[PDB]
């Protein structure tokens, strides 16, 4: 029973992140932008 | 339970593995970004005078191979001959440094001569005597004298005794540069031509092989590095003698420190400042000030750009090293991320 | 039903509270490499000890320090130094996080985590060269530490803050003994009174990495990983981390018991270690010795052990018993390295090949095993009914080469012998099967009381088992009474001498005889 | 770019490189050997940067004729070596050339042969059974399917031909790949192997890598690391069943040995680099299995002058699932397989695995064993005769049990002519119960040398004039 | 003046100093590691002159956390320890510091620890013995006032009680005092011994000294000569008989030989130190009567792989004068001190020293001791009725005669609330005579048990 | 490829060659025979080492 259960989680785990993997996409060019203002020290929208 | 602990800690695991990629996709996208925000030089300057801002704001604070009986000797000796030099002559000191150039060359060829020189021995008097009968009248007074001072004081190892007497003779040289009132000019150049020889490999290798002939050697120098038209005259003689007199010593590390030592004879601490780009002459003083207040020695800095910084500047002093490079603020963010 | 919510905000708090202000920095360049020790020039203040970064992530430690350059034993990942690369300085010598949250997770000797669970929240950190409690700062060593070995608890009796060096050749039993202690602890655990429960530190030096996975499922089983910590430096790791990992172990221990907890660490094995220090002391062409050790590799071993200690009410009474383990060769416990842990260690349990295929499980030799601490470190009961144990075995060992004459032997002799085969019958046990004080105090009670003598030899173990089963499932009572009275009453022992008889009346030998009477 | 050899003392070679020119460590590096008799491209090993821009190397082949000066190339890798379905069915050396056939393998993919070792995340203990046929084996040191299992023995006492019997019964049924690892031995050894292996039909699923105990120090140092490259390759790529066999281990350690003094490291105890251990163990670890890849390995260890307290096989001893130890005084006694049956273990001989039966008849026979081992003394100086009858009975039955633990091996037939068996492990499990309980002890016991299972002993006892 | 690191290799430092200051050897020098966590000041002490004005010395602490170029202080003496009165009932390290007490006794007289030996015609020509009043150790093992006596015995065979009574016994009787030097000392035991010591009462007439096992190998080889340096302030400076004992002297040999391998010096035979025997020497010489004072000494010997011609153990019984061996099979049987007669030895049992009786009644006890122990196995597997009566006339004699070595000891009052017997030389020589003669077979056994002289056993037997 | 063990202790004795029965070996074994003699002396090793 254990091994059927890890099977089925690790499937439904990775459907699951794929699906998240595909939702983040749109939230990294706002941070990177913030990443990249912050170590520049000069706070740039761009 | 155990299957239940299985499971969440598989989920976590997921969890931290597509943190991890957007992590890294963030970097890369940060690196991409910051890459574009350099490519106007303003921003480079903008940059610069930040971090500068940040070394005014930051606080300060406060050869070594010699062993002691070596070391002790060598400074009584540097003591003896800016004794010496006290009104000496432009051209007496060029006298004296060629004939201490002759003398350290010939203690390296006479290894017996060197060796008996060079014994540790409590009295002094029979060496002089010996200094004497070799070459009393051969040389001027005040480099036989140095020589007697050089042979009275002990000696680590044998090798230190040939540097000593050279050491004198570079020593000699930049206070004819001194009463010359060029002594930038000699640094430029000497921290011009060590640049060169280290990025010189081949050059600096065939220079700094001892058993070719001097002779051939400082002529090759001549007709390749040092005879060129726009060449300060007193940092080409240096560098001529110092490679004349190589004792092993690498031809790139031999010109750094005798860059060094021009520097120190004005007391001043050589800094060695990586750049994205050419300073200002504004931001030049600014950093010649910051690094003097945080080290309190005056400091020369010698500005050496390198494309890769992207921005700030890599400051080195010492074994000591304050890293404005933004190239370095990148590396920190692609490791710090989880 | 991962939320793209908690990554996005983890990633955003990382970002947004980014700074990397520039700090003045000391750093020499890498002089000469080879083999996992790194020559650096420069660094002029950097301590004895002391912490070095090397590009690429990479870890290393000062130990030779001389005018020329610092000698670093690099901690991993030695295949990516080079001659020219700038090394920095931390500024702190070796130190570990400690915590709670170290309970059941599987670290290397920086406190990193291996097992792939994650992070591990850390309450403090710990510098590895702590010094050991001051000699005013302990009290005596008195509270057991039950390890459920009937021959060790009997014979050698452990107590809190002692160590016991468990030495021996190969195959002999050594960790399976660590590990019966560790399983013995749970139910201590399960108490949840700070002054029973006794966390355990698990050190693997030298260990293959399936060998390591072997022994966290062995303590998962029997539900030890709630209360264990295991620090890892397998046979793949540099010899610093095999040199290191003690250290690691012995600074999270510590951690727990200057708090007032009781803590079990495990050493497998210090041989492991030695042979590690000795390899770094060579490739930093330090003096050789006997054996081509270095000239404190006692030292390295002794300043490990004298951390393990029993510590004064004053502060907090907490204590950490050590466990190291020793591989001998051919069983000569005269080696370097063996006769220096014995002569650290505050007792010995030898374990033997010969006793071993004898059957005699665990293998430990009664006759030269010893525990200095001794009757201190037992509870009343045991030490009432384990008192004549030594005399009786030591007589049966002077008497076995009678075996086959005992009707030659006057009736003193032969009643000897056959006590003695009994007791040491008892005293065998089945691995992974760890006993209860009491249990352990009513078994002697049976070998020592003349229970057994009726009973065939070869069926004395099931006898014991079974009937230690029948107690536990109709006189509880008697178990109970031994536990919270850490002694057997007068009224007890009747009623257990009345259930043996019982019991005896309803027990089968394997031979088809009777063992009433 | 290039360096220029500086020194050159036996194996080790020093060479000078340009500023910001050092080859990273473990680089190979190409050299010319021009002399026409002994023209060459030596394959140099970087192990030291040594300071001042020069390195310290292995040369991986003799370096007879190097002259000082000659320049010396950096290629800006390690050793590496084909990989792929492809070595199947190949003799390859160390460097990854191909033997049988020149040039073979250039266009496959390559793998550099220094790796690190599987995450300990990944690793999964195994306790599954492999049945081999063996008497002994399969009774007092029972391999793992997917385990590490080891042959320890002094110089000919049997380790090749149980390597042999052992390919011969597991490889030759094996669903997956074989590497054979050839380290430091008879290259006579490795060409009848070969012919073996091709005669059998197991060459094409079988990959080996021979590099010979003629070879200089640096190719028995890095033979082991190629053919466990290909292993790996096939572990963790192909995800099938991999059995790999090396033949001997002991010699990577020895090779080391011989060059670390050169590579100037203070010797340690016995004669042996100071990194013996931590190079075992980077070897040793990343012969393994993980979670759902299997790797079934199976490795001679050579234990110097019969000592097994000598530290490489001391060393090596921490490594093993399983390990038959051989002995020299059972091989004279004429026993064979020369196994040890006190001294030789196995990780899964417990009642949980093997069941309750076995272990009670493994452990009985040990017992049965030791006993007899304590009076072989006694029964020497005063004789049989002075033993009480239960110790007589003893013996008869130690010495019956002794002799029946040996068996004709299939790869022993060249040895003593008689055609090899195989006992199933139910079989033996009651041919050792009757024996330990005295059902054979009116046998004579020359019955019971070197048969297989209880008919070939009753057919034996009938041609000695006893019946069963 | 001052010195600097220059390079730290573990316990090995070497320290620079000016030309004209050079400290001398075994000079103290003080460092300081100021970080935090392992912040202290390093004591290391000059070992070798390198030249150049270079020094090598032995850290007696860890090093870690030690920089180059620190100043190192030179303090003009080897390393200086606290004598007189006031050590008595304090625990000491090697370096004199005060464990129970840190800063007590800075402000005594300070002796350095490296004292040569009495000169050699003030040295005694005759040996004497030290009667103690134990009539085992009086009878069969006589001690050598100023000698060397070796100790060996397991756990849980009395050893501690032993040194108690030996401790009670130089303090009452001879009005002395008693240095404690542990030389390895394993830390839980320091601290055993320090509480036991103070129940006992004891501690005020001694002086603890520890080298503890976690210490650096330089403190493990300087507190005996530490500890010495306190007995012989009270034997020279105070005219007292002193007891010193040393536990473990092979601690003391195999720190040496760490400290040799560590200055890099080739090891002699089987590993050890060069100077094995000068070291050994230097140690022991100081042991000795002079001026009418002594200091006598009970050491703890352990013997490597129980290889009594191993050359630690050869070294050191080149200096032992009286040998006790503490068997556990005579603890069991309740005999206190649990001495073994036959394996235990002195040199000076010989009639030119004891005189002819003394020696006499000693080996006629022993031939009946070794006798008895001859038939105990036949005793053991064939019964006691198996023998002769001449036979069981001798068990019975050897019983009543083992039984009568037991004594009641002082340090056994803390046990038992009887208190301890001291029997005179004489009383002792007679009372055995009669007993070797059969003039208290018939006695009842129990009547020799733990009682001192003649008269006690009267007194016992008509209790009976 | 083998070896062949000869003894003083055996020489001694008379058993010239001194070959150690018990310890000497051939690595090449029946292949290096012809037939006949390897009919004939197919296990006299093994019966002459038990
Ligand atoms: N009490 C016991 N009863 C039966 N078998 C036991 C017992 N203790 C250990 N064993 C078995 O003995 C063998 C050796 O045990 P273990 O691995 O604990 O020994 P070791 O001395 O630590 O070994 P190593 O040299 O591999 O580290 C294993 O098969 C273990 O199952
Ligand atoms: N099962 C066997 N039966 C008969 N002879 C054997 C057997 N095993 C080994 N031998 C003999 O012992 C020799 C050594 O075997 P081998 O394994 O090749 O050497 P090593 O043990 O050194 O690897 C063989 O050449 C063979 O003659
Ligand atoms: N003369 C004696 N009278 C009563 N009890 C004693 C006597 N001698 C020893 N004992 C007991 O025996 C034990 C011996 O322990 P200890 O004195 O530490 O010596 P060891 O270190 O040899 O065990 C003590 O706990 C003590 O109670
Ligand atoms: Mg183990
Ligand atoms: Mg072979």
């Given at each position: ?46 | ?338 | ?34 083999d ?199 046979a ?282 | 770019?290039?360096?220029?050899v500086?020194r050159i003392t036996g194996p080790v070679v020093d060479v ?9 460590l473990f680089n190979a590096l190409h050299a010319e050997i021009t002399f026409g008799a002994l023209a060459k491209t030596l394959t140099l090993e970087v192990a030291q ?7 310290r190397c292995i040369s991986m082949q003799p370096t007879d004729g190097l002259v000082?000066?000659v320049?010396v190339t950096?290629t800006?890798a390690s050793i590496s070596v084909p990989v792929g379905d492809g070595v199947k069915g190949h003799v390859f050396n160390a460097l990854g050339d191909c033997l049988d056939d020149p040039g073979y393998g250039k266009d496959f993919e390559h793998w550099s042969i220094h790796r690190?070792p ?12 492999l049945?081999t046929g063996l008497?002994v084996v399969?009774?007092?040191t029972?391999y793992?399917?997917?385990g590490k299992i080891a042959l320890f023995g002094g110089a000919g006492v049997g380790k090749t031909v149980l390597i042999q019997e052992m390919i011969n019964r597991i490889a030759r049924n094996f669903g997956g790949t074989s590497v054979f690892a050839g380290v430091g031995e008879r290259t006579r050894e490795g060409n009848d192997l070969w012919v073996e292996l091709a005669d059998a039909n197991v060459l094409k699923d079988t990959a080996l890598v021979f590099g010979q105990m003629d070879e200089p120090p640096g190719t028995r140092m890095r033979v082991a690391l190629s053919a466990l490259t290909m292993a790996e390759f096939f572990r963790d790529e192909q995800?099938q069943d991999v059995l790999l066999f090396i033949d001997n281990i002991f010699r990577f350690t020895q090779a080391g040995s011989e060059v670390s003094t050169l590579l100037?490291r203070?010797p340690s105890?016995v004669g042996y680099q100071?990194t013996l251990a931590d190079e075992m163990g980077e070897l040793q670890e990343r012969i393994t299995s993980?979670?759902?890849?299997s790797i079934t390995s199976m490795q001679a260890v050579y234990v110097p002058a019969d000592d097994y307290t000598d530290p490489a096989p001391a060393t090596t001893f921490a490594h093993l699932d399983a390990t038959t130890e051989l002995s020299r005084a059972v091989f004279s006694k004429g026993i064979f397989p020369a196994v040890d049956?006190?001294a030789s ?61 040996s068996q004709n091996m299939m790869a022993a037939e060249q040895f003593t002519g008689q055609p090899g068996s195989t ?27 070197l ?18």
């Amino acid at each position: 029973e254990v091994a059927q259960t890890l099977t089925q989680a690790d499937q439904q785990l990775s459907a699951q992140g794929d699906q998240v993997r595909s939702g983040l996409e749109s939230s990294v060019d706002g941070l990177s932008a913030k990443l990249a203002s912050r170590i520049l020290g000069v706070d740039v929208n761009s | 339970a155990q299957g239940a602990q299985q499971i969440q800690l598989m989920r976590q695991q997921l969890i931290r593995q597509l943190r991890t990629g957007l992590g890294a996709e963030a970097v890369n996208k940060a690196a991409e970004i910051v890459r574009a925000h350099v490519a106007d030089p303003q921003a480079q300057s903008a940059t610069v005078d930040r971090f500068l801002s940040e070394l005014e704001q930051m606080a300060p604070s406060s050869t070594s191979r010699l062993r002691a009986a070596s070391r002790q000797s060598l400074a009584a000796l540097v003591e003896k001959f800016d004794s010496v030099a006290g009104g000496l002559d432009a051209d007496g000191l060029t006298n004296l440094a060629d004939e201490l150039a002759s003398v350290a060359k010939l203690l390296l060829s006479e290894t017996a001569l060197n060796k008996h020189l060079a014994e540790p021995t409590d009295d002094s008097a029979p060496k002089v005597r010996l200094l004497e009968r070799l070459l009393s009248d051969k040389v001027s007074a005040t480099t036989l004298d140095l020589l007697r001072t050089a042979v009275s004081n002990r000696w680590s190892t044998e090798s230190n005794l040939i540097d000593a007497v050279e050491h004198t003779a570079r020593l000699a040289l930049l206070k004819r540069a001194e009463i010359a009132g060029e002594v930038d000019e000699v640094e430029e150049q000497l921290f011009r031509f060590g640049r060169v020889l280290d990025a010189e490999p081949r050059l600096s290798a065939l220079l700094s092989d001892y058993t070719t002939p001097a002779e051939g050697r400082v002529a090759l120098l001549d007709k390749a590095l040092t005879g060129r038209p726009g060449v300060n005259q007193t940092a080409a003689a240096l560098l001529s003698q110092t490679v004349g007199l190589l004792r092993g010593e690498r031809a790139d590390e031999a010109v750094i420190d005798l860059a060094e030592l021009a520097v120190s004879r004005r007391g001043e601490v050589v800094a060695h400042v990586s750049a994205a780009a050419e300073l200002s002459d504004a931001q030049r003083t600014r950093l010649t000030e910051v690094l003097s207040r945080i080290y309190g020695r005056p400091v020369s800095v010698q500005l050496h750009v390198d494309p890769e910084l992207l921005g700030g500047l890599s400051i080195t002093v010492g074994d000591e090293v304050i890293d404005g490079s933004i190239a370095s603020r990148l590396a920190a963010a692609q490791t710090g991320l989880p | 039903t991962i939320s793209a919510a908690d990554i996005e905000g983890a990633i955003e708090d990382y970002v947004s509270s980014f700074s990397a202000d520039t700090e003045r920095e000391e750093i020499g360049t890498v002089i000469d490499a080879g083999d996992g020790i790194a020559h650096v020039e420069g660094l002029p203040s950097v301590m004895t000890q002391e912490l070095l970064e090397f590009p690429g992530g990479v870890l290393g430690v000062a130990l030779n320090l001389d005018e020329h350059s610092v000698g670093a034993v690099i901690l991993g990942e030695f295949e990516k130094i080079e001659e020219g690369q700038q090394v920095k300085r931390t500024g702190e010598v070796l130190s570990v996080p400690v915590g709670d949250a170290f309970l059941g997770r599987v670290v290397n000797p920086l406190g990193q985590p291996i097992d792939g669970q994650g992070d591990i929240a850390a309450e403090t950190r710990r510098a590895l060269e702590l010094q050991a409690p001051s000699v005013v700062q302990r009290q005596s060593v008195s509270e057991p530490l039950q390890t459920g070995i009937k021959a060790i608890d009997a014979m050698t009796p452990i107590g809190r803050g002692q160590r016991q060096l468990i030495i021996g050749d190969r195959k002999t039993g050594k960790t399976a003994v660590c590990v019966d202690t560790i399983l013995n602890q749970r139910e201590a655990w399960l108490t949840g009174d700070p002054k029973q429960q006794v966390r355990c530190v698990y050190v693997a030096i030298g260990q293959k990495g399936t060998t390591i996975a072997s022994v966290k499922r062995a303590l998962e089983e029997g539900g030890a990983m709630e209360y264990t910590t295991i620090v890892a430096a397998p046979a793949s790791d540099a010899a610093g981390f095999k040199w290191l990992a003690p250290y690691t172990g012995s600074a999270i221990g510590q951690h727990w018991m200057y708090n007032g907890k009781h803590v079990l660490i495990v050493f497998d094995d210090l041989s492991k270690q030695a042979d590690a220090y000795r390899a770094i002391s060579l490739l930093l062409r330090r003096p050789p010795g006997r054996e081509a050790f270095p000239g404190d590799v006692f030292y390295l071993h002794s300043r490990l052990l004298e951390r393990c200690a029993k510590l004064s009410d004053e502060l907090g009474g907490g204590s950490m018993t050590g466990l190291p383990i020793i591989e001998t060769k051919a069983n000569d416990i005269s080696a370097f390295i063996p006769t220096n842990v014995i002569s650290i260690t505050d007792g010995q349990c030898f374990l033997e090949s010969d006793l071993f295929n004898q059957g005699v499980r665990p293998a430990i030799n009664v006759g030269v095993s010893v525990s200095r601490v001794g009757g201190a470190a037992q509870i009343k009961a045991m030490k009432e009914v384990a008192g004549s144990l030594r005399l009786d075995l030591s007589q049966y060992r002077e008497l076995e080469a009678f075996a086959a004459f005992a009707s030659d032997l006057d009736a003193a002799s032969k009643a000897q012998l056959d006590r003695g085969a009994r007791l040491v019958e008892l005293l065998k046990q089945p691995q992974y099967s760890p006993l209860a004080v009491e249990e352990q105090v009513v078994a002697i009670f049976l070998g020592t009381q003349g229970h057994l003598d009726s009973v065939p030899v070869e069926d004395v173990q099931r006898f014991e088992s079974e009937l230690l089963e029948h107690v536990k499932a109709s006189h509880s009572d008697i178990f109970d009474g031994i536990r919270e009275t850490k002694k057997l009453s007068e009224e007890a022992e009747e009623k257990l001498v009345s259930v043996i008889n019982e019991f005896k009346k309803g027990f089968q030998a394997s031979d088809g005889s009777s063992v009433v009477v | 770019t290039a360096g220029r050899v500086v020194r050159i003392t036996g194996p080790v070679v020093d060479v000078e490189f340009p500023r910001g020119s050092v080859p990273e460590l473990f680089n190979a590096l190409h050299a010319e050997i021009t002399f026409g008799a002994l023209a060459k491209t030596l394959t140099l090993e970087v192990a030291q940067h040594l300071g001042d821009s020069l390195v310290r190397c292995i040369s991986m082949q003799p370096t007879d004729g190097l002259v000082r000066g000659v320049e010396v190339t950096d290629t800006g890798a390690s050793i590496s070596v084909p990989v792929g379905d492809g070595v199947k069915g190949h003799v390859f050396n160390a460097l990854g050339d191909c033997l049988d056939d020149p040039g073979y393998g250039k266009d496959f993919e390559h793998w550099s042969i220094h790796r690190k070792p599987p995450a300990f995340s990944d690793l999964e203990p195994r306790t599954e059974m492999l049945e081999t046929g063996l008497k002994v084996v399969d009774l007092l040191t029972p391999y793992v399917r997917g385990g590490k299992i080891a042959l320890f023995g002094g110089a000919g006492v049997g380790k090749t031909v149980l390597i042999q019997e052992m390919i011969n019964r597991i490889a030759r049924n094996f669903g997956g790949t074989s590497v054979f690892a050839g380290v430091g031995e008879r290259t006579r050894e490795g060409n009848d192997l070969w012919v073996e292996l091709a005669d059998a039909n197991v060459l094409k699923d079988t990959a080996l890598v021979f590099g010979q105990m003629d070879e200089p120090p640096g190719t028995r140092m890095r033979v082991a690391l190629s053919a466990l490259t290909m292993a790996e390759f096939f572990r963790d790529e192909q995800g099938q069943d991999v059995l790999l066999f090396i033949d001997n281990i002991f010699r990577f350690t020895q090779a080391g040995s011989e060059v670390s003094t050169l590579l100037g490291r203070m010797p340690s105890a016995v004669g042996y680099q100071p990194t013996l251990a931590d190079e075992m163990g980077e070897l040793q670890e990343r012969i393994t299995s993980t979670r759902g890849r299997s790797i079934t390995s199976m490795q001679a260890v050579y234990v110097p002058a019969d000592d097994y307290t000598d530290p490489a096989p001391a060393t090596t001893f921490a490594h093993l699932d399983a390990t038959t130890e051989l002995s020299r005084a059972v091989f004279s006694k004429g026993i064979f397989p020369a196994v040890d049956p006190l001294a030789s273990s196995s990780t899964i001989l417990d009642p949980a695995i093997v069941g309750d039966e076995h272990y009670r008849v493994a452990q009985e026979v040990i017992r049965i064993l030791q006993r007899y081992k304590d009076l072989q003394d006694i029964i020497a100086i005063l004789g049989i005769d002075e033993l009480s009858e239960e110790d007589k009975q003893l013996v008869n039955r130690a010495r019956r049990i002794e002799r029946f633990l040996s068996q004709n091996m299939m790869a022993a037939e060249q040895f003593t002519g008689q055609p090899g068996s195989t006992v199933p492990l139910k079989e033996t499990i009651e041919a050792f119960d009757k024996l330990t309980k005295g059902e054979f002890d009116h046998l004579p016991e020359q019955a019971f040398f070197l048969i297989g299972g209880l008919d070939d002993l009753a057919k034996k006892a009938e041609s000695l004039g006893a019946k069963l």
